Structure 1
Amino acid sequence: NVAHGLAWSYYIGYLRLILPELQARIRTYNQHYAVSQRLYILLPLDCGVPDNLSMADPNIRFLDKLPQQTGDRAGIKDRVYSNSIYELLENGQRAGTCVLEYATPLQTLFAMSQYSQAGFSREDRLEQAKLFCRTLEDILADAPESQNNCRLIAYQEFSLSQEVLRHLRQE
């Protein structure tokens, strides 16, 4: 079972650290340059994770980078954590701005697919994706750092933008 460890490292190595200081980073960018106060993580269950968000959906267009977050991490002095802000256009009109990004471990699960000495097969990507989404939301349920600082966007394959709009419109 690979997805279990990837969900935990994703929380132990990233979410536990940037979420407590995310609200302050969004606040700092709003005063200098109306993004919502939440990190939205795309987790396609197909694990079709492209590197460019605009390449996946034309409606999803990059807006600007969040103020970097630094920190000494495992012998790396001032390791920079980067978060990208995106605006979502529907029918040529922007309807929401947010800090949007994919769940990178899913990209890793998709690539681990191809290799020979990977644990899981190439036909178990989907259940691994389903196992990652369940384990992450299980962790973020009992996680004291996730004080409604992020929301999980899980879907199966289409309009990605309006799935994103559905959640931000909720806020």
Structure 2
Amino acid sequence: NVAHGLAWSYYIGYLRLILPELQARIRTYNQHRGAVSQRLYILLPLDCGVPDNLSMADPNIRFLDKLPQQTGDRAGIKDRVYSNSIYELLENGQRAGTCVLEYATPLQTLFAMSQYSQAGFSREDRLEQAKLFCRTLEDILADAPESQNNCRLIAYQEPSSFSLSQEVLRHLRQEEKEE
């Protein structure tokens, strides 16, 4: 049940420090083309396949720019930088949305752990732990609307023809339906 600790680490050491400041950074970018959505969209692939370049996971997800970096002193590191990337979502050659998009990195940690023999984490427990991570993280944000309003969890499982851009657009449009 390592996924439980990674979910809490994900919130304590990240979501709870950037999301209270995200709207400010979003509106700052729009001021100083297209309107960036005001939520952090977090990709939770249950197969734990976490590429580093989204464009390689789906060409329709096209990097646009970066937000204004957030900084802060943490654990003896001066000016620890929290940066986020803005992606355009394409659909049949058209820009259907623009949002701050990224994977949940701890799912990449789960994947790596399953390969290290010293970690005592079997390759078979990847899916189960990924789901415990999603469930735990969802339960955490349910008790912190400050952060829940600032992000949407996009958990998915590829069966083999899958569209990641279409998966994001579904959440991005259901959010605009209640805007």
User: What is the distance in 1 between the residues matched to 2:59 and 2:120?
Assistant: 35
Name the CA shift for 1:154/1:147 in 2 (closer, same or farther; >3 Å). closer
User: What is the distance in 1 between the residues matched to 2:29 and 2:156?
Assistant: 30
CA contact (8 A) 2:43 2:104 kept: yes
Give the RMSD, CA atoms, in angstroms: 0.9
CA contact (8 A) 1:2 1:119 kept: no
User: What is the distance in 1 between the residues matched to 2:117 and 2:11?
Assistant: 27
Q: CA deviation at 1:144?
A: 4.8
Q: CA deviation at 1:118?
A: 1.6
CA contact (8 A) 1:39 1:99 kept: yes
User: What is the distance in 2 between the residues matched to 1:167 and 1:60?
Assistant: 15
Q: CA deviation at 1:101?
A: 0.1
Q: CA deviation at 1:142?
A: 0.7
Who is 1:28 aligned against? 28
User: What is the distance in 1 between the residues matched to 2:68 and 2:47?
Assistant: 31
CA contact (8 A) 1:26 1:37 kept: yes
Name the CA shift for 1:165/1:144 in 2 (closer, same or farther; >3 Å). closer
TM-score normalised over the length of structure 2: 0.93
Q: Deviations over 1:24-80 (max 9, x none)?
A: 000000012x10000000000001100000010000000000000010111011111
Q: CA deviation at 1:117?
A: 2.0
Structure number with higher strand proportion: 2
TM-score normalised over the length of structure 1: 0.97
CA contact (8 A) 1:112 1:118 kept: yes
SS at match of 1:146: helix
Q: How many residues align?
A: 170
SS at match of 2:62: strand
CA contact (8 A) 2:73 2:79 kept: yes
Question: Structure 1 vs Structure 2: percent identity of aligned residues?
Answer: 100
User: What is the distance in 1 between the residues matched to 2:141 and 2:58?
Assistant: 28
User: What is the distance in 1 between the residues matched to 2:25 and 2:44?
Assistant: 23
Structure number with higher helix proportion: 2
Q: CA deviation at 1:8?
A: 0.2
SS at match of 1:72: strand
Which blocks of at least 5 consecutive residues in structure 1 are unaligned? none
User: What is the distance in 1 between the residues matched to 2:145 and 2:91?
Assistant: 35
User: What is the distance in 1 between the residues matched to 2:120 and 2:26?
Assistant: 39
Query: Would you identify which runs of 4 or more consecutive aligned residues in structure 1 move more than 6 Å?
Result: none
Q: CA deviation at 1:143?
A: 2.0
Q: Deviations over 1:78-130 (max 9, x none)?
A: 11101000000011111000000000000110111100122421111000000
Moved more, 49-58 or 139-148: 139-148
